[PDB]
What we know:
The structure is a homohexamer.
Chain A: H1 2-11, H2 14-23, H3 31-48, H4 57-75
Helix pairs in contact in A: 2-3, 2-4, 3-4
Amino acid sequence: GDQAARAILIERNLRLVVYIARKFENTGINIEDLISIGTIGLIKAVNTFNPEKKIKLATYASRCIENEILMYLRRNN
Amino acid sequence: AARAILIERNLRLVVYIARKFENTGINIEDLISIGTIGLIKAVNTFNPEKKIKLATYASRCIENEILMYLRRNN
Amino acid sequence: NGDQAARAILIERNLRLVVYIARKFENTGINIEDLISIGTIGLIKAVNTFNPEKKIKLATYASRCIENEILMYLRRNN
Amino acid sequence: NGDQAARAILIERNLRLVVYIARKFENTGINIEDLISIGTIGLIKAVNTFNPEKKIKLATYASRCIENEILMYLRRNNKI
Amino acid sequence: QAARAILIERNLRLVVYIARKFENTGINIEDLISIGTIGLIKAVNTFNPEKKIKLATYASRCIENEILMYLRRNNKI
Amino acid sequence: QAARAILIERNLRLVVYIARKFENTGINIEDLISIGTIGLIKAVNTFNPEKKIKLATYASRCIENEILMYLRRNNKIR
């Protein structure tokens, strides 16, 4: 029910995870870790997104994906 | 924490399972993302008293998530 | 129930959706007749559980439920 | 009641629907007068349960309720 | 009640007998039967299984009243 | 544990067999399969095994009834 609704929104924004993950890729930071971590942020975005406000999902998701990655990068120096 | 330890410690498992689907021609980046969803489902639904190890249960959930995604779109 | 009369209207209005989706799974050598039946079950579940004041259209939600029912049928029989 | 006035407006607005649907079911052994009354009960139920927040016309919804009352009446009286 | 349905269905003829006495207007008998049936439903929903007035007489009044109010609302009787 | 899908899957060809009976009705078979399936769903949800009637017997009655109601409602020859 609610699960299927979130799956639709998650799967439509997967490329957004990759796009942001590639920005943070460089020496020592493996892209495959960043895709996973970023995907976690996308899941958090879809679960907390409020469609009754004027921020589009892709913009709110971008913020959550970045945030998840930055906190991973700070946790692992 | 706790759950976040289990997830971060098994990110490589997603890559290992996703590479099994190389011959589908589907972008490995998308499979990894899809498989990560499977890994997060496995952690959220484990129950350690069922006598099944978390790595094997997660292997199933990761492979299954990818399989459903591939058949849903083929 | 008046709710069931409304659900019946939206199910019958969208039987074509079951066919359009069922026909995509024809390469998985299962009879189209079975796929329509299984897909219809997913349409019934969609209309029964759809939340109209959420932001997902009925056709989008029902396509997901029709797919999910077929995919569960394919995984049970493989 | 204000809500009674609103329901009255909607019932009277769709009485043509009762007659048209009843005429479709008129047959030998089935009195049109009975079908109009039975159909009118279906219309009353439609207006009392209709939800405008959904995406179904009242007329679409009413006609379904009208048909359903007439069908159950014919099944109940063994006129299938 | 489930017994409401029985009371209504076997008083359907009552609606016709009353509605037929108003077909000296310019309103179709079909609409009068529909309106009278509203009067019958109102009577059954507001009937007391007692008192010195019982179903048939109370239903006749409500059926006639609804038809009268429908015709007066459209400026006939 | 609650998987009643064994019952439903076992009666799918019953839907097609009944829907083929209306070959002479000008309704596409795809619609009749869906409508019949609705009938099978109602059968399994209201089947009483304590009564003396087999499920496939009761299921056929609801499958055919669902189709007949759909055809009457749409003014099609039965």
